[PDB]
Structure 1
């Protein structure tokens, strides 16, 4: 379907465009199914992952000046582990 649901370890449900979620090779495999559960990714990490998908889709193949993707120091370690698992 047009949108997919990504559920964090703490139960937050993130509804993102299917195309945006396909940025993650891991999610792309898990779908090919309209919902994915992440028992190791909390909401403060998964929300940032979804913001990254939006950022990536908006700024890839674009000549408009690309801004820095911000990562708070407090989330950096978990976000790194999540990015590594998600292949994105």
Structure 2
């Protein structure tokens, strides 16, 4: 139902499992509760957590699809966690 995520500095999150299976690494770890990350920044983790709900909610509907707001500064290190997670 609920899975646990740990950031680099200790930022700890709880995520619904339906959104949790979206990530390949999370799916692999759960298939093989509590998930720990070592180098993922807290702000980057907070930004990437919301994309799971954004994708799940708008998976079927394609009416407007508002643009995802990404700052130019944060996009450089967003891929840092995006590649590792997926």
Q: Report the TM-score, using the length of structure 1 for normalisation.
A: 0.89
Q: In the TM superposition, what are the counterparts of 1:19-30 in structure 2 within 5 Å?
A: 19-30=18-29
Cα displacement string for residues 28-51 of structure 1 (whole angstroms, at most 9, x for unaligned residues): 111118111110101100011111
Tell me the CA shift for residue 66 of structure 1: 0.6
Count residues in correspondence: 86
Gaps of 5+ in 2: none
Task: Tell me which moved more, 65-74 or 53-62.
Answer: 65-74
Q: Report the TM-score, using the length of structure 2 for normalisation.
A: 0.91
State the SS of the aligned residue for 1:5.
Answer: strand
- Give the 3 Å change call, closer, same or farther, for CA 7–86 of structure 1 in structure 2: same
- Give the 3 Å change call, closer, same or farther, for CA 72–83 of structure 1 in structure 2: same
Paired with 2:62 and 2:32, the residues of 1 have a C-alpha distance of 35
Question: Where has structure 1 moved over 4 Å in runs of 4 or more?
Answer: none
Paired with 1:57 and 1:71, the residues of 2 have a C-alpha distance of 19
Cα displacement string for residues 37-70 of structure 1 (whole angstroms, at most 9, x for unaligned residues): 1101011000111111010101111133111111
Task: Tell me which moved more, 57-66 or 5-14.
Answer: 57-66
